[PDB]
């Protein structure tokens, strides 16, 4: 009486929603993970929702040679 998935895929899906709701919708929620991983970030780019840059978690050492500053030397003390 229970439908078979590989012969009639859609009929099985309706039965599982109605007769095994906890198992069926776990698979549906579990599959929404990958679905939003494919839809939203492309969607967000189009609307202009840009990703924030990472915050610094270490001292941000400036790239390049040292600037050769002249100021606040020892003669400036006192």
């Amino acid at each position: 009486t229970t439908p078979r998935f590989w012969s009639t895929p859609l009929k099985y899906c309706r039965w599982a929603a109605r007769e095994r709701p906890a198992l069926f919708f776990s698979v549906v929620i579990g599959a929404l993970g990958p679905v939003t991983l494919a839809t939203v970030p492309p969607l967000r780019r189009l609307i202009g929702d840009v990703d924030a840059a990472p915050i610094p978690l270490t001292y941000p050492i400036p790239p390049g040679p040292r600037k050769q500053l002249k100021g606040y030397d020892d003669d400036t003390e006192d």
Partner: protein, 334 residues
């Protein structure tokens, strides 16, 4: 600092532990009165004014009753289980923040501390049933241990979803992170599952086979006399209050509301209390409203309904967080 550290720790411990036990005593009085109003009756109204001394009468009666231990199996082992259950049921109050950082121990691993001390409390129940030297009561205490560990999995799976939102195990940070929104709205299915798990975790109805006397094989807690009954009962009410406090912390914004230090502290304490009291009321409300689930059905509910949904939510939620660039920072903030 200003005064002695030992004095501060004494006072802070006394301020959390002593009023906690007063609240646990009146949760038992409130349970009887709430079920009575629901049952068209009064509940305790004669032991003390308005029945306000009923729990103290109960405790003193049991503490002066004679204990009937087993057939000299062991003195230490017999009390060992009850002692463990009470101590570790009460140890979890030490990380509850009654305001930002207003906890006995403001711990960065606080959520894991609460999980650990709950796991150590299940030992006392199992070590009691064995020590009773009655194979009938052992099976009930065994079934009760199976239910407690299975729904411990439900609670720690639900809690993992909250940590993903806040990025921290500090109870304070979890509460501060809800100034944005109480987690009951974004994590509404999780809150419902967590509350159900907390009822099962406390051997409370409709999950109350441990104390059920009408069920033929149930009622492991029903053979506990005098001091041993006091140990187990205090531990259970203590866990009920703590599961309601932790539920408010994780989903109802903790101590958050809807200039003087004394009044700010009072309002934070009151807001946490109001939220905790509401969940205690619901906790009593479900015991009065439902019949009891069979052991085989309650294990099937955990393992074939709640856990498959939670593990599905464990996939979906971080995918949503990544997709919306809302993975929180894990540094000390808030």
């Amino acid at each position: 600092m200003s005064y002695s550290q030992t004095i501060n720790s004494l006072v802070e411990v006394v301020l959390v532990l002593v009023p906690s036990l007063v609240g646990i005593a009146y949760v038992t009085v409130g349970e009887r009165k709430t079920m009575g109003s629901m049952q068209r009756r009064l509940g305790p109204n004669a032991v003390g004014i308005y029945g306000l001394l009923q729990a103290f009468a109960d405790a003193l009666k049991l503490l002066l009753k004679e204990y009937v231990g087993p057939t000299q199996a062991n003195l230490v082992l017999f009390f060992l289980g009850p002692v463990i259950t009470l101590i570790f049921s009460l140890l979890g109050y030490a990380v509850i923040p009654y305001g930002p950082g207003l906890a006995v121990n403001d711990l960065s691993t606080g959520i894991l501390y609460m999980l650990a001390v709950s796991s150590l409390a299940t030992y006392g129940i199992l070590l009691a049933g064995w020590s009773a030297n009655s194979k009938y009561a052992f099976l009930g205490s065994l079934r009760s241990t199976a239910q407690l560990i299975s729904y411990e999995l439900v609670l720690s799976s639900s809690i993992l979803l909250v940590i993903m939102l806040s990025g921290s195990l500090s109870l304070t940070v979890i509460v501060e992170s809800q100034r944005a929104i109480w987690y009951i709205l974004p994590l509404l299915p999780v809150f419902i599952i967590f509350f159900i798990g907390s009822v099962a975790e406390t051997n409370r109805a409709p999950f109350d086979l441990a104390e059920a006397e009408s069920e033929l094989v149930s009622g492991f807690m029903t053979e506990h006399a005098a001091v041993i009954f006091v140990f187990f009962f205090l531990a259970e009410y203590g866990s009920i209050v703590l599961m309601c406090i932790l539920t408010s912390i994780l989903f109802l914004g903790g101590y958050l509301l809807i200039n003087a230090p004394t009044v700010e502290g009072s309002f934070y304490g009151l807001s946490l209390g109001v939220k905790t009291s509401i969940l205690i009321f619901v906790f009593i409300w479900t015991r009065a409203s439902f019949p009891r689930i069979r052991f085989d059905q309650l294990m099937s509910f955990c393992w074939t309904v709640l856990l498959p949904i939670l593990f599905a939510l464990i996939v979906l939620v971080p995918c949503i967080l990544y997709s919306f660039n809302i993975f929180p920072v894990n540094i000390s903030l808030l």
